[PDB]
Design an enzyme around this catalytic site. Structure first.
Site, PDB file in Angstrom:
ATOM      1  N   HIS B  27      52.384  46.762  42.083  1.00  0.00           N
ATOM      2  CA  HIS B  27      52.485  45.786  43.040  1.00  0.00           C
ATOM      3  C   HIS B  27      53.571  44.899  43.019  1.00  0.00           C
ATOM      4  O   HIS B  27      53.767  44.171  41.980  1.00  0.00           O
ATOM      5  CB  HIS B  27      51.330  44.844  42.718  1.00  0.00           C
ATOM      6  CG  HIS B  27      49.781  45.583  42.610  1.00  0.00           C
ATOM      7  ND1 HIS B  27      49.610  46.093  41.681  1.00  0.00           N
ATOM      8  CD2 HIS B  27      48.823  45.538  43.449  1.00  0.00           C
ATOM      9  CE1 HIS B  27      48.283  46.845  41.640  1.00  0.00           C
ATOM     10  NE2 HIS B  27      47.727  46.370  43.027  1.00  0.00           N
ATOM     11  N   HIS B 262      51.964  44.855  49.216  1.00  0.00           N
ATOM     12  CA  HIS B 262      50.987  44.564  48.320  1.00  0.00           C
ATOM     13  C   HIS B 262      50.733  45.461  47.008  1.00  0.00           C
ATOM     14  O   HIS B 262      50.948  44.817  45.592  1.00  0.00           O
ATOM     15  CB  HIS B 262      49.529  44.422  48.858  1.00  0.00           C
ATOM     16  CG  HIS B 262      48.562  44.275  47.927  1.00  0.00           C
ATOM     17  ND1 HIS B 262      48.094  42.794  47.245  1.00  0.00           N
ATOM     18  CD2 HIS B 262      47.886  45.018  47.275  1.00  0.00           C
ATOM     19  CE1 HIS B 262      47.245  42.997  46.372  1.00  0.00           C
ATOM     20  NE2 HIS B 262      46.829  44.284  46.203  1.00  0.00           N
ATOM     21  N   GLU B 410      27.091  30.249  34.665  1.00  0.00           N
ATOM     22  CA  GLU B 410      27.251  31.256  33.419  1.00  0.00           C
ATOM     23  C   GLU B 410      28.796  32.107  33.353  1.00  0.00           C
ATOM     24  O   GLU B 410      29.252  32.312  32.593  1.00  0.00           O
ATOM     25  CB  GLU B 410      26.192  32.137  33.640  1.00  0.00           C
ATOM     26  CG  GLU B 410      24.737  31.663  33.413  1.00  0.00           C
ATOM     27  CD  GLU B 410      24.133  30.971  34.652  1.00  0.00           C
ATOM     28  OE1 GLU B 410      24.938  31.211  35.877  1.00  0.00           O
ATOM     29  OE2 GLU B 410      23.129  30.171  34.686  1.00  0.00           O
ATOM     30  N   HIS B 472      13.161  36.215  35.943  1.00  0.00           N
ATOM     31  CA  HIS B 472      13.619  35.530  34.618  1.00  0.00           C
ATOM     32  C   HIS B 472      13.612  36.132  33.398  1.00  0.00           C
ATOM     33  O   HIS B 472      13.646  35.962  32.239  1.00  0.00           O
ATOM     34  CB  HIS B 472      12.894  34.297  34.562  1.00  0.00           C
ATOM     35  CG  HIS B 472      13.347  33.290  35.281  1.00  0.00           C
ATOM     36  ND1 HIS B 472      13.570  33.186  36.926  1.00  0.00           N
ATOM     37  CD2 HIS B 472      14.249  31.875  35.044  1.00  0.00           C
ATOM     38  CE1 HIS B 472      14.131  31.959  37.301  1.00  0.00           C
ATOM     39  NE2 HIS B 472      14.432  31.260  36.250  1.00  0.00           N
TER      40      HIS B 472
HETATM   41  C1  LIG Z   1      21.418  31.572  37.510  1.00  0.00           C
HETATM   42  C2  LIG Z   1      20.620  30.945  37.103  1.00  0.00           C
HETATM   43  N1  LIG Z   1      21.030  30.243  35.964  1.00  0.00           N
HETATM   44  C3  LIG Z   1      19.996  29.395  35.516  1.00  0.00           C
HETATM   45  C4  LIG Z   1      18.831  29.171  35.730  1.00  0.00           C
HETATM   46  C5  LIG Z   1      17.858  28.172  35.032  1.00  0.00           C
HETATM   47  N2  LIG Z   1      17.514  26.791  35.936  1.00  0.00           N
HETATM   48  C6  LIG Z   1      16.407  26.728  36.639  1.00  0.00           C
HETATM   49  S1  LIG Z   1      16.378  25.587  37.507  1.00  0.00           S
HETATM   50  C7  LIG Z   1      18.007  24.948  36.918  1.00  0.00           C
HETATM   51  C8  LIG Z   1      18.526  23.642  37.416  1.00  0.00           C
HETATM   52  C9  LIG Z   1      17.833  22.737  38.461  1.00  0.00           C
HETATM   53  O1  LIG Z   1      18.892  21.975  38.913  1.00  0.00           O
HETATM   54  P1  LIG Z   1      18.637  21.876  40.496  1.00  0.00           P
HETATM   55  O2  LIG Z   1      19.255  22.851  41.340  1.00  0.00           O
HETATM   56  O3  LIG Z   1      19.545  20.638  40.535  1.00  0.00           O
HETATM   57  O4  LIG Z   1      17.257  21.130  40.789  1.00  0.00           O
HETATM   58  P2  LIG Z   1      16.101  19.972  40.406  1.00  0.00           P
HETATM   59  O5  LIG Z   1      14.936  20.691  40.447  1.00  0.00           O
HETATM   60  O6  LIG Z   1      16.365  19.781  38.612  1.00  0.00           O
HETATM   61  O7  LIG Z   1      16.623  18.989  41.338  1.00  0.00           O
HETATM   62  C10 LIG Z   1      18.295  25.901  35.988  1.00  0.00           C
HETATM   63  C11 LIG Z   1      19.439  25.794  35.120  1.00  0.00           C
HETATM   64  C12 LIG Z   1      18.527  29.897  36.861  1.00  0.00           C
HETATM   65  N3  LIG Z   1      17.269  29.901  37.621  1.00  0.00           N
HETATM   66  N4  LIG Z   1      19.442  30.851  37.616  1.00  0.00           N
HETATM   67  C1  LIG Z   2      37.063  41.168  40.789  1.00  0.00           C
HETATM   68  C2  LIG Z   2      37.864  41.893  41.388  1.00  0.00           C
HETATM   69  N1  LIG Z   2      37.518  42.520  42.795  1.00  0.00           N
HETATM   70  C3  LIG Z   2      38.632  43.054  43.522  1.00  0.00           C
HETATM   71  C4  LIG Z   2      39.794  43.528  42.896  1.00  0.00           C
HETATM   72  C5  LIG Z   2      40.884  44.402  43.631  1.00  0.00           C
HETATM   73  N2  LIG Z   2      42.181  43.694  44.054  1.00  0.00           N
HETATM   74  C6  LIG Z   2      43.250  43.814  43.343  1.00  0.00           C
HETATM   75  S1  LIG Z   2      44.499  42.676  43.922  1.00  0.00           S
HETATM   76  C7  LIG Z   2      43.279  42.433  45.262  1.00  0.00           C
HETATM   77  C8  LIG Z   2      43.946  41.593  46.248  1.00  0.00           C
HETATM   78  C9  LIG Z   2      44.305  40.124  46.022  1.00  0.00           C
HETATM   79  O1  LIG Z   2      45.179  39.646  47.062  1.00  0.00           O
HETATM   80  P1  LIG Z   2      45.968  38.209  46.364  1.00  0.00           P
HETATM   81  O2  LIG Z   2      45.658  37.883  44.977  1.00  0.00           O
HETATM   82  O3  LIG Z   2      45.834  37.514  47.488  1.00  0.00           O
HETATM   83  O4  LIG Z   2      47.417  38.744  46.866  1.00  0.00           O
HETATM   84  P2  LIG Z   2      48.712  39.682  47.224  1.00  0.00           P
HETATM   85  O5  LIG Z   2      49.079  40.427  45.905  1.00  0.00           O
HETATM   86  O6  LIG Z   2      48.033  40.471  48.291  1.00  0.00           O
HETATM   87  O7  LIG Z   2      49.578  38.503  47.693  1.00  0.00           O
HETATM   88  C10 LIG Z   2      42.007  42.894  45.142  1.00  0.00           C
HETATM   89  C11 LIG Z   2      40.945  42.620  45.977  1.00  0.00           C
HETATM   90  C12 LIG Z   2      40.113  42.889  41.516  1.00  0.00           C
HETATM   91  N3  LIG Z   2      41.329  43.187  40.991  1.00  0.00           N
HETATM   92  N4  LIG Z   2      39.237  42.309  40.912  1.00  0.00           N
END
Ligand SMILES: Cc1ncc(C[n+]2csc(CCOP(=O)(O)OP(=O)(O)O)c2C)c(N)n1
Ligand SMILES: Cc1ncc(C[n+]2csc(CCOP(=O)(O)OP(=O)(O)O)c2C)c(N)n1
Ligand SMILES: [Ca+2]
Ligand SMILES: [Ca+2]
Lengths: 671, 670
Positions: B27, B262, B410, B472
């Site tokens: 690139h 690109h 995460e 989960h």
């Molecule tokens: C991707 C993912 N990561 C972690 C969890 C664990 N988890 C369940 S509810 C929650 C936080 C809840 O916070 P929020 O959406 O703010 O609402 P609340 O019910 O406390 O108002 C988490 C971390 C999950 N369900 N999914």
């Molecule tokens: C997670 C992920 N998804 C897709 C790709 C494929 N990919 C490599 S470069 C690129 C375009 C990103 O363009 P950008 O950073 O905007 O700049 P450019 O070099 O076109 O200016 C893509 C989709 C990648 N490397 N990683």
């Protein structure tokens, strides 16, 4: 006949949610109690739906992205009259009930997608909104507004912190999905405690910057007029997706309201009794829905029911003035494929990359299957998912009838959106990206498998065949992972014929998602390839009587196996088995599997991936032992010993070690 | 002579172009567009010593948009790093020090491995956190021994990725003032114009996220603006910075401003015209003017003096603070204070391994000061913040804190852990539910590829989760992690094994480790031992002349042991605990043969799918699909993962394959 006040309805919801969680001795009472007011207004006054017909195709879609608060959705579904009884509610989080810990598609009437993993719902909703906009642009006609509904989605702080959510909201803003209405429950609490511990963005300014029309309701605990106006404004404003930011008190009413203690544990019998008295309700009765509250819901549903009837008549007139479109509409909403499409798919000819073979298939499929809708995650010219001959038009706010979606570099959101598109009805969604980056979206892929979504992933650049991009772009362990995943098809075609077979399988799998593993480099077409074979998962492309060795391979490695078989001609009678899809093979009867991989006969597998998982079929594997490198494909294959000579050597040693029917039996044979 | 800043930038542009052209792949676009900013940053602002890439107080540089690595290779060479013109000519070629994307360890001056978009930004956040923490921990009045900035390049693709957004959000929240993000906005991606899928008002958006955004409208030729932006960034405190420069992708090329530049070589003709356009020789390739080199040399001489002065400051510091000086040097080397393992807990009462892990951390945090961890908004569930540790959260007002609140992020958490490890002086760990590690495989894969020592405290490892349900409950994720090269997946059965697991994780300097912990209590085993865990698999229950082996891991070992006892009168059974399959496979053939003797039928027990178990067992008692919503106890019976099912399977196996007739596994004759 008496109609409960909006507040009585809200409090009734709060308490039912509390009783549900309590009866399950597990669950999240907090959010359900906090979003009760908004839910009362939304479900008894604004949202268009028929509890007596969850399948009404023009119904507004509702999704609770913050799935842990599903006690709230179960309560609403019951009160509204869906086929979810009080007994179902009393069975919350219990064995075999219709009310599991988190919303599950098909398990519960009225649930559109399954959530729980945060951020997914929001992206599903974006897909639901894209579907409505596209179908409306495709079927609506002057005087015939047959497609017109909104997508409502609840979400919490957790959802907004997740990248999959940010990705989807970003695309939604860019697409200007005006009928998408996100209701953000901002209560400053998460599991760890206050949101200020890790989340402090100026949300209003942020989402406006992303193209959202933000509407705030400072007091979401009791400001009913505010809630009413917010929803009205959301429906009135055009050109932008909406985000209603309501500030609420988690577990409103509970003695521990506003703290993380009401997030994910039953409130307790005493606290529940005080909450009821506080709302002027009987502190002794549980799972108690006032009949006047049911009356409020009944009045609303009667109105929407009339709307459906009126809608059914419009579709009837519509179908009369547009016979063809009406038949198509009905056909697409059922997920039916126009007949004769499979016979139109391409067959082997010149040596090409299966990536190009897939494009040749889409060149036929786009015009033959009008329901088909797909795109790539900013890899269109690489995935070859937009065949020029198809004369496609990109889906955009100014061309909603377009069928090609430019997802941008958003793999996770793309895959979750695909689930939303499938959940809507009327769409057959596919999304492309490099196989190695599907890893960025396993959170959504898993749900497609759990929810039985028919989504297709065009995953190109499937191995070291990629070449120069290097190890960070070459998959060696991802296919094994996808193969371990329940209800997921991982098809790795070897040529044009097997590729058409793969698309045929992917398209006809109504309840199973499919990953199409495509190569970047050319592969040599095999005369023994066939669609019928692909449908069986594994089959012989080269057979010989009284075989002494079986060489099984997939994708770009089948040619190696064939050449290896030739080189061994004089010595051993070798059968070559092409195995494009292990999931389909395993589903075949014992007699068919025994006929392909006969017990006692040594088997060598060839695939440019790690050996993990191959032991269920072969006695030796010729593939990768670690990560790849940056160099031309041809150099990499020799470097890692994935060659014809290596296959020949391995086959020879196996035949020597296990002569005439002494090859170790595999678990599947005596299982 | 001293080349003007423009001549330096044009030299960078042309070298990057020749680098890509020489590899017949790559690139050229972005490299050319960011040449101006690079010229200023690398010859005037960034503090680094090309003669010592390991200088601990050097500013860190990350190119998140790794595809444009030709730019970084050109810069490293011009700066004098150990990367010759030959290396450059080997771009994207077999065995070269210049692969298609930046690879940690393969190239001098490359901090982390990028390529997968968004990871670089997240890594940079981790590098910035480490610097801020180490400064707060070791700096003393008059002794500023830790003080450097983290520069990171990113493009449109990076900003579209969730892992990027998650990381920037946390960076804003943590107010990482020394983190400087340079965003190359050129309105071009692979599909073409960014208006096809990306149209946010970035300035307002990132200010809302806590960033101080500085714009340079003309990043193609406004050198004063570029110098000013960087100066302002260094002077502005309290917030991370994002310099948004608007450039022309492939500036100079006839196809500039289009997706055509690109990811494809410009071609011999266009390259010749580009050089002529810049007043350079259109015939010479890989040509670096001596006056341009003198500019870099002058800069490196200054930074070199800074290092020497820094070394003297560290010497004075060490004289005034003997203990701290020793600790600093030790930590930066990744050395663990002796005696830590001997302090780990051993079996007692029946507890969840999730609690067992907390007991380990209660010992490790105080024993290993470099240890820094956190959870993705699951602290009270992962049990990663032992109360006795008296921990303080890392925040803008408490940079010496050792616990990070990642929030529900995460993916960024995992990418940040990689960044913390790449810095030096930190031993990072992050917690979340095992099932959601699936959200972070992008970063986990890079930890394995880059040989990072990061520890994942992944609790709620199975249907043991219970009521939360199938969304989960992991049933297939462990198989995925086991297929991954250079990744240790340890599933301890009890306190002793959990202590063994942490011991392994902490001592694996080049291998990331996933700790699979249970939510529910497990029964401790008298046969468990740390030595056993180090071997991957070992007998916890043995018998002479065995007739059946039952292998298990984590919470299922107790099932195997109970099944063994139940079969006492019928069969002679050995129970094998296999907490880590990777370590077992690494053992010599004689040891493996001794644990799983050939010819003897094997039954494996684990609450996951069978995929992959065939390499060890002839039958598997576990999951056949996704879970369900009900109490744990109910789920184990429902899915047939019980002692009676194990006993029944062991019986049928021993019956079908008596005395040495069990099918041979691949590993035995391989
Ligand atoms: C991707 C993912 N990561 C972690 C969890 C664990 N988890 C369940 S509810 C929650 C936080 C809840 O916070 P929020 O959406 O703010 O609402 P609340 O019910 O406390 O108002 C988490 C971390 C999950 N369900 N999914
Ligand atoms: C997670 C992920 N998804 C897709 C790709 C494929 N990919 C490599 S470069 C690129 C375009 C990103 O363009 P950008 O950073 O905007 O700049 P450019 O070099 O076109 O200016 C893509 C989709 C990648 N490397 N990683
Ligand atoms: Ca919240
Ligand atoms: Ca760009």
């Amino acid at each position: 006949r008496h109609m409960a006040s909006i507040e009585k309805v809200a409090n009734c919801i709060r308490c039912l949610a509390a009783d549900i969680v309590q009866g399950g001795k597990s669950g999240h009472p907090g959010t359900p109690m906090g979003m009760a007011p908004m839910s009362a207004v939304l479900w008894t006054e604004v949202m268009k739906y028929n509890s007596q017909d969850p399948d009404w195709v023009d119904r507004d879609r509702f999704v609770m992205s913050n799935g842990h608060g599903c006690a709230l959705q179960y309560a609403l579904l019951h009160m509204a009259g869906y086929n979810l009884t009080m007994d179902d509610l009393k069975g919350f989080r219990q064995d075999g009930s219709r009310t599991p810990g988190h919303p599950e598609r098909f398990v519960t009437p009225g649930v559109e997608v399954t959530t729980g993993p945060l951020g997914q719902g929001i992206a599903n909703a974006v897909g639901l909104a894209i579907a409505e906009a596209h179908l409306a642009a495709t079927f609506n006609r002057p005087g015939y507004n047959i497609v017109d509904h909104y997508t409502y989605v609840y979400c919490g702080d957790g959802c907004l912190m997740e990248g999959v959510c940010q990705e989807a909201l970003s695309l939604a803003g860019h697409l200007a999905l005006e009928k998408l209405i996100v209701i953000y429950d901002s209560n400053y609490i998460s599991i760890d405690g206050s949101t200020s511990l890790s989340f402090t963005e100026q949300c209003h300014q942020k989402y406006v910057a992303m193209g959202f029309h933000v509407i705030e309701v400072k007091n979401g605990d009791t400001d009913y007029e505010g809630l009413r106006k917010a929803l009205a404004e959301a429906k009135a404003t055009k050109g932008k997706p909406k985000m209603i930011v309501q500030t609420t008190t988690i577990g409103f009413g509970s003695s521990k309201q506003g703290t993380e203690k009401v997030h994910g544990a039953p409130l307790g019998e005493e606290d529940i009794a005080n909450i009821k008295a506080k709302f002027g309700r009987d502190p002794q009765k549980k799972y108690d829905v006032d009949d006047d509250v049911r009356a409020v819901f009944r009045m609303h549903i009667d109105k929407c029911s009339a709307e459906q009837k009126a809608w059914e008549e419009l579709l009837a007139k519509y179908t009369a003035a547009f016979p063809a479109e009406g038949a198509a509409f009905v056909a697409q909403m059922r997920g039916e494929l126009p007949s004769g499409w499979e016979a139109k798919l391409p067959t082997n000819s010149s040596a090409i990359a299966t990536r190009k073979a897939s494009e040749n298939c889409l060149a036929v499929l786009f015009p033959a299957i009008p329901a088909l809708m797909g795109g790539s995650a900013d890899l269109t010219p690489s995935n070859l998912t937009r065949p020029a001959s198809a004369n496609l038009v990109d889906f955009s706010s100014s061309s909603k009838e377009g069928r090609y979606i430019r997802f941008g570099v958003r793999e996770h959101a793309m895959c979750a959106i695909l689930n939303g598109l499938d959940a809507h009805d009327g769409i057959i969604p596919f999304g492309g990206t490099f196989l190695n980056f599907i890893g960025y979206a396993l959170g959504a892929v898993r749900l497609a498998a759990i929810s039985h979504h028919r989504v297709i992933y065009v995953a190109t650049h499937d191995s070291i065949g990629v070449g120069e991009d290097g190890p960070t772009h070459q998959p060696v362990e991802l296919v094994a992972a996808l193969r371990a995943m329940p209800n997921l098809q991982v098809i790795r075609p070897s040529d044009q014929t097997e590729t058409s077979g793969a698309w045929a399988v992917a398209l006809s799998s109504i309840h199973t998602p499919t990953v199409l593993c495509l190569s970047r480099q050319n592969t040599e077409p095999q005369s023994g390839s066939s669609i019928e074979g692909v449908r069986h998962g594994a089959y012989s492309v080269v057979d010989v009587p009284d075989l002494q060795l079986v060489i099984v391979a997939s994708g770009s490695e089948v040619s190696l196996a064939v050449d290896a078989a030739k080189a061994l001609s004089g010595e051993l009678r070798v059968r070559v088995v092409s195995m494009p899809c292990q999931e389909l093979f395993d589903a075949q009867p014992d007699t068919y599997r025994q006929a392909v991989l006969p017990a006692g006969v040594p088997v060598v597998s060839v695939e440019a991936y790690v050996s993990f998982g191959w032991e269920k079929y072969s006695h030796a594997h010729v593939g990768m032992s670690g990560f790849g490198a940056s160099a031309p494909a041809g150099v990499l294959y020799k470097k890692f010993g994935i060659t014809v000579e290596e296959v020949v050597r391995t086959g020879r040693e196996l035949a020597k070690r296990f002569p005439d029917g002494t090859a170790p039996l595999k678990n599947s044979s005596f299982s």
